[PDB]
Structures are given as structure tokens and as C-alpha cells.
Structure 1
């Protein structure tokens, strides 16, 4: 049962639009099974049903890191990254990271 140790953007961060989103876990991820979806849950001034933003997901420089690369620049608003992490123990762990763009 791997744990999300940290991320950039960090949970609850509000700032610049990220070129890539890094999720750092407590255990080495098995890439074939670990995934993420990026959704926008609000624009400034108005919440909306989650709208899936095109993104690619891959491994980073470290086996414990999952990288989400939006296909395009993220506009101002609120986003969530819904993640699934699987290590060598085979248990699928899910969670979400929420952050805001300026």
C-alpha cells in the first residue's frame, strides 16, 4: 500500500500553471499499472462538473515518481489529479491531489 509522500504542485497550492505535475510515492511504482487522470473542477468564480484535460502520464527520473504532462497550458482554476499507484506488492492505491492555477 504505497503512500503519496509529496507532489509538485503541492496539495492545496495556488500558483503558476505547471508544465508537468510530479507525484512522489513511498515505494517504486510499476509503470504498466500506475496511472492518473487530470480534471478541472472550477474556473475562477465558478465550480463545474469535473472536465477531463488531455494529459500523458509516465515515470520520472526516480522509480517512485509519476509524471503527468498536460498536453496544453492549464488556464486559471482548480484541478485535481486522480491517481492510481501500484508497487511490487500488487495493491492498487488511489487518491487525488488538488491544486489551483493563479
Structure 2
């Protein structure tokens, strides 16, 4: 209803890498305390513990429209987008989306 209404992040997407990660909220939040990052949680060679990966966080022409780009070409493996959105009146929403790549 209010808060996050639509996104195209990569909700359990498998196969080709997700193009970008879009987050859209009914509410005009983002009081200078929102952001998002990407971590890889399976990658070849290692299968070592989940670790921070290279993403760039942007927004559209609205502060309430978050747009996260991967900065490296996402290769075969599994990743987690962690996003954290905050409002003026506090009300943190902190959340995550996992996806896979081949």
C-alpha cells in the first residue's frame, strides 16, 4: 500500500544476468539514509562465504525511485541485493532479493 509497491530487482531470477535493479515505493521516503549493495553468495573456484560485490547505486529522477546497476559484468553464480530504505519519520524498511546467473 504505502512503502515499496513495485520493483524489478531480480526476485529469484535464474539464467541471464538481471539487466539492472529497480525499486519503486508509493511513499516519498529516502531522507538521506537509504542505499543498496550487492554481495555474491556463490561463485566458481571458491564457494567461499558470501562477500561484497561491485555494484553502483543510483536513483531515477525521483528520490523514491532507486536504481542499482551491477558495476562488474555479473557472471555465473548466486548473488544477494541488500537494499535499505529509510523515511523522514524513521520507519526503516530493510530488505533483500537473491538471484542466480549462468
**Fold conserved (TM > 0.5)?**
yes
- Matching residue of 1:94: 94
Cα root mean square deviation, aligned: 2.6
Find runs of 4+ consecutive structure 1 residues off by over 6 angstroms.
Answer: none
Which sits farther off after the overlay, 6-15 or 71-80?
6-15
TM-score by length of 2: 0.78
Matches within 5 A, 1:34-53: 34-43=34-43, 47-53=47-53
Measured after TM superposition, the shift of residue 80 of structure 1 is: 0.7
Equivalent residues, number: 102
- Structure 1 unaligned segments of length 5 or more: list them: none
Q: Quote the Cα distance in structure 2 between the aligned partners of 1:54 and 1:93.
A: 23
- Structure 2 unaligned segments of length 5 or more: list them: none
